Amino acid sequence: YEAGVRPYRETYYDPDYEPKDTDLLCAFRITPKPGVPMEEAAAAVAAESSTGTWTEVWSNLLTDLERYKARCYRIEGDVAYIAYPLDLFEEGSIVNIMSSIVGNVFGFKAVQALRLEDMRIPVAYLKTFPGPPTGIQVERDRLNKYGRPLLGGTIKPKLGLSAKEYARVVYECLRGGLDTTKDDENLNSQPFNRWRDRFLYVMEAVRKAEAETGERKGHWLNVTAGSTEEMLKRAEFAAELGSRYIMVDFLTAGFAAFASVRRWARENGLMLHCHRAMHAVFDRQPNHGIHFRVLAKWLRMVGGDHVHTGTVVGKLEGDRAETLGIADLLREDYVPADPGRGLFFDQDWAGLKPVFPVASGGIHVWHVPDLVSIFGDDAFFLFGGGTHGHPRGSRAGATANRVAVEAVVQARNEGRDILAEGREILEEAARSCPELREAMELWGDVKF
Amino acid sequence: YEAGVRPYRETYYDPDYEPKDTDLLCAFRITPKPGVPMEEAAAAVAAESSTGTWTEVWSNLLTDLERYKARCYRIEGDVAYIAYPLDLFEEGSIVNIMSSIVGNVFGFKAVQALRLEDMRIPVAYLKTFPGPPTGIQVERDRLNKYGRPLLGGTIKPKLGLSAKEYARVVYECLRGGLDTTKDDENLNSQPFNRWRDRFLYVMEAVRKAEAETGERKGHWLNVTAGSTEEMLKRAEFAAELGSRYIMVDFLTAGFAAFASVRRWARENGLMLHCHRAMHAVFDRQPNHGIHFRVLAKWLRMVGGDHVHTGTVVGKLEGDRAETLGIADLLREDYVPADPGRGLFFDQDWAGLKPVFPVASGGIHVWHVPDLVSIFGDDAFFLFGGGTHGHPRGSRAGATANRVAVEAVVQARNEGRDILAEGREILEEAARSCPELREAMELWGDVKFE
Ligand SMILES: O=C(O)[C@@](O)(COP(=O)(O)O)[C@H](O)[C@H](O)COP(=O)(O)O
Ligand SMILES: O=C(O)[C@@](O)(COP(=O)(O)O)[C@H](O)[C@H](O)COP(=O)(O)O
Ligand SMILES: [Mg+2]
Ligand SMILES: [Mg+2]
Numbered sequence: 001y002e003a004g005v006r007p008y009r010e011t012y013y014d015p016d017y018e019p020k021d022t023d024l025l026c027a028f029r030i031t032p033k034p035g036v037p038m039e040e041a042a043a044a045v046a047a048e049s050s051t052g053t054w055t056e057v058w059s060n061l062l063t064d065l066e067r068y069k070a071r072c073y074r075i076e077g078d079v080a081y082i083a084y085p086l087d088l089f090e091e092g093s094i095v096n097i098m099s100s101i102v103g104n105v106f107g108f109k110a111v112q113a114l115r116l117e118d119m120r121i122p123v124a125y126l127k128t129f130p131g132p133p134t135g136i137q138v139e140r141d142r143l144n145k146y147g148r149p150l151l152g153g154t155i156k157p158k159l160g161l162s163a164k165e166y167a168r169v170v171y172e173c174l175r176g177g178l179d180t181t182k183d184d185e186n187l188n189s190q191p192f193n194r195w196r197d198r199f200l201y202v203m204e205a206v207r208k209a210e211a212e213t214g215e216r217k218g219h220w221l222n223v224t225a226g227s228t229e230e231m232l233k234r235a236e237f238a239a240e241l242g243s244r245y246i247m248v249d250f251l252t253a254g255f256a257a258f259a260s261v262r263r264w265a266r267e268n269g270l271m272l273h274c275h276r277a278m279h280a281v282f283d284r285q286p287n288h289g290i291h292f293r294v295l296a297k298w299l300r301m302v303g304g305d306h307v308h309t310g311t312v313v314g315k316l317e318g319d320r321a322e323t324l325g326i327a328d329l330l331r332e333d334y335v336p337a338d339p340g341r342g343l344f345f346d347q348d349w350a351g352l353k354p355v356f357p358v359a360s361g362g363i364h365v366w367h368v369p370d371l372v373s374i375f376g377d378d379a380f381f382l383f384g385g386g387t388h389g390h391p392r393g394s395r396a397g398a399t400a401n402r403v404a405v406e407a408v409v410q411a412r413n414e415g416r417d418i419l420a421e422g423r424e425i426l427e428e429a430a431r432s433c434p435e436l437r438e439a440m441e442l443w444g445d446v447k448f
Numbered sequence: 449y450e451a452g453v454r455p456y457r458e459t460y461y462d463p464d465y466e467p468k469d470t471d472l473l474c475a476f477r478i479t480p481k482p483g484v485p486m487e488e489a490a491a492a493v494a495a496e497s498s499t500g501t502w503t504e505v506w507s508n509l510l511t512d513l514e515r516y517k518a519r520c521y522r523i524e525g526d527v528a529y530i531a532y533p534l535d536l537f538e539e540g541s542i543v544n545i546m547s548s549i550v551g552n553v554f555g556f557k558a559v560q561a562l563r564l565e566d567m568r569i570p571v572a573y574l575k576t577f578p579g580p581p582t583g584i585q586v587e588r589d590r591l592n593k594y595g596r597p598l599l600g601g602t603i604k605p606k607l608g609l610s611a612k613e614y615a616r617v618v619y620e621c622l623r624g625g626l627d628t629t630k631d632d633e634n635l636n637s638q639p640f641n642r643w644r645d646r647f648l649y650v651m652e653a654v655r656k657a658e659a660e661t662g663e664r665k666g667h668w669l670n671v672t673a674g675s676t677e678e679m680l681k682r683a684e685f686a687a688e689l690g691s692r693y694i695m696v697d698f699l700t701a702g703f704a705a706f707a708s709v710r711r712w713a714r715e716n717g718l719m720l721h722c723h724r725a726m727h728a729v730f731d732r733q734p735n736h737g738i739h740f741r742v743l744a745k746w747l748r749m750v751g752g753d754h755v756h757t758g759t760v761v762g763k764l765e766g767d768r769a770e771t772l773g774i775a776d777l778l779r780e781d782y783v784p785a786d787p788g789r790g791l792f793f794d795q796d797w798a799g800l801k802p803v804f805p806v807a808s809g810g811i812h813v814w815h816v817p818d819l820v821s822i823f824g825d826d827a828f829f830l831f832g833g834g835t836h837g838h839p840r841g842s843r844a845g846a847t848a849n850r851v852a853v854e855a856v857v858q859a860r861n862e863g864r865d866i867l868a869e870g871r872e873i874l875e876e877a878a879r880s881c882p883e884l885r886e887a888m889e890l891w892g893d894v895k896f897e
Contacts, residue, residue, distance in 0.1 A: 254702005280555030
């Protein structure tokens with residue numbers, strides 16, 4: 001034992017280290033404090049997210065730190081690659097992953113900015129997670145909906161509607177052609193719209209639209225609440241009412257409570273829509289935070305049946321190439337690394353079920369060719385304002401959106417160039433769909 | 449009903465609005481996309497965090513939007529003030545506050561960066577929250593410790609120690625003078641150290657150190673786990689073993705599970721240490737995120753008995769003036785606005801109990817004058833590496849740290865200027881304490897900016 005401060009890089013930078021298949025790997029984009037070399041900043045991150053602290057401690061000799069320490073094993077420009085032994089992590093706990101990987105290292109004086117870009121979850125650790133409770137293919141079977149994107153939409157105004165008027169809007173949307181509708185992420189239980197009232201009114205409207213259309217419907221009833229116990233109480237009521245779905249804001253509720261609801265959802269046979277509210281607080285800026293592709297991996301591990309991925313073309317920010325990579329991470333059995341999409345690692349998904357991407361936010365009929373081109377069939381497209389903002393209201397808007405999606409799907413199946421002919425495809429459909437004609441006219445001037 | 453897209457500012461910018469005492473107020477620092485005026489960007493934030501969306505909807509006429517909409521009511525440079533009616537929020541739910549205020553508005557194309565600086569929680573909403581399960585004054589009575597900062601320290605190395613060796617370090621620290629010790633935030637249950645074993649070994653060491661010193665001791669047993677059910681299972685065992693404390697990483701576990709643990713702690717009579725792991729992921733940068741003072745307010749509302757606040761002088765970033773304001777938000781009954789410290793609003797705490805600030809991270813004996821100057825008596829100072837890194841180990845390090853704090857507190861109560869006379873106060877104590885002498889000698893040239 002030699003007391004005293006040593007540079008972090010002495011113990012935690014090891015560019016000769018060869019990662020094991022069981023290691024968890026991180027790619028961090030590092031902005032060192034001016035004067036601090038990349039090697040020392042990267043080693044600081046490795047040390048303070050695994051075993052080390054700021055000075056040598058006598059108790060380091062009471063264990064084999066060579067067995068347990070994280071190691072920065074590669075630095076490419078400002079990207080540091082760090083390997084973490086499998087033994088460092090609690091089985092089945094995303095919460096533990098976060099507590100190590102993003103716990104303290106984003107606040108060090110020596111590292112002025114830090115962004116977690118990607119993470120390689122090893123198969124041996126992935127096997128301790130349950131994954132989605134339903135999965136894309138089982139969900140399609142429960143809905144009896146194949147060969148096309150699924151249609152949804154958030155009820156608007158976000159807040160302020162009574163339970164009765166809220167369910168009226170739900171009914172009009174489902175009756176007009178949407179497969180699903182959803183509570184806004186911030187609609188939980190409030191004086192103007194209490195959750196028990198909303199759940200009862202809405203399921204009546206869902207049943208009525210299902211009977212009248214002859215198609216299966218769902219509403220994503222938001223069980224997000226102030227405590228885990230309260231969330232599970234709201235889920236139980238949704239199950240009692242025969243809802244196919246519940247919805248959780250998995251980041252604002254938090255991963256521990258999210259895990260509790262996932263367990264409940266699987267055991268009670270309901271599908272779990274996951275809203276990513278708060279994600280942009282820390283995934284927006286390229287110099288600091290956690291890229292969404294990491295959150296998407298953690299989501300698939302805990303188990304959501306859908307998660308929002310962005311639209312690329314709508315009102316909220318989202319890079320096209322990054323979104324294509326995120327879609328693959330959610331849906332495929334194995335995703336090879338791709339620097340063009342910010343996928344720093346190969347990701348084997350170890351047989352876990354796939355997750356539906358959900359494209360929502362500021363989209364309307366003119367975006368449908370782009371969205372089908374981006375996502376293919378296995379996605380939800382959500383039209384909130386793009387449904388209720390139709391000149392003739394929600395039911396007509398739902399018809400316009402549903403017809404537009406089916407027209408573009410048909411064109412793709414016929415081998416047409418759905419981007420090169422997108423407007424022509426929509427105009428053909430509009431000739432026998434007045435609602436689509438009226439939607440195209442209203443929003444023809446609205447781009448982001 | 450007029451269909452089509454309107455500017456957000458038409459409905460959601462109201463510079464003549466006078467906030468009500470029941471309103472929830474937010475101060476956002478807004479960086480608009482180039483070409484987007486501040487009024488439109490601020491109105492977009494107000495709209496998309498309350499009632500609006502990107503195009504006019506027929507259902508807007510099915511309610512009274514004027515009664516429920518949020519309104520940007522003042523702009524000062526790049527800071528927009530937004531008022532939210534009380535009816536918009538679910539009683540007792542921080543989760544609901546976040547889902548509205550920070551739910552989607554940080555990801556809009558029209559607003560390239562956004563930072564929530566402060567939030568005025570109105571009294572009528574605050575009354576629906578329970579606050580800390582113990583509180584500073586009740587906690588001091590439970591510990592029978594008065595008139596000084598309390599001493600703690602994280603066990604090191606962070607991970608890798610067996611339960612037996614882990615508790616050996618705990619015992620040496622508590623025996624040497626620390627009031628408490630704690631699990632690292634990332635020590636939960638792992639192959640080298642399972643939580644049931646750790647809880648048993650550690651509580652034996654706590655009881656042994658309490659019997660040999662004659663002073664009450666505690667260890668912050670981390671119950672942070674993958675699910676709410678598992679966290680409550682670990683808390684139960686901590687209570688069965690007679691621990692005074694449990695610990696939760698309230699942000700990585702999340703606020704819904706945090707509230708579940710707070711309720712458990714109050715009902716089972718255990719004190720709740722709250723670690724802010726992950727906070728810097730979104731409170732570090734000045735252009736985008738949520739300032740920690742907002743997280744501190746939410747923490748006191750749900751109810752933690754301590755929360756980390758930073759050290760200012762240690763290894764992790766923290767601004768001195770902002771930290772002074774955060775300490776006041778955690779401890780005082782009422783906190784007036786203070787632009788010089790980033791407190792944009794008066795905050796009435798409506799009778800809620802206060803929270804212990806906790807200063808931890810890279811600090812050693814030379815930082816003690818600054819730490820007592822910044823925080824006063826009602827705080828914990830934690831020395832992890834600053835204890836176990838002593839030339840003669842944890843027991844000697846704990847004595848050095850305890851002696852330094854009591855000397856600086858002594859000199860302060862002696863009318864001395866502990867900042868100007870800091871080096872001399874420590875050296876006077878170093879003459880009668882060789883442990884302190886060796887600590888000061890070892891870390892003399894270890895400085896953080
Ligand atoms: O609150 C909203 O804005 C929405 O209901 C969209 O409403 P519109 O359909 O009326 O735009 C969705 O929650 C966002 O799209 C979520 O963003 P993301 O999908 O990027 O998480
Ligand atoms: O993991 C660590 O670094 C610590 O155990 C400090 O160890 P040392 O005492 O050896 O530095 C604490 O968790 C940090 O202080 C937390 O940061 P904050 O208090 O700013 O949340
Ligand atoms: Mg929404
Ligand atoms: Mg720690």
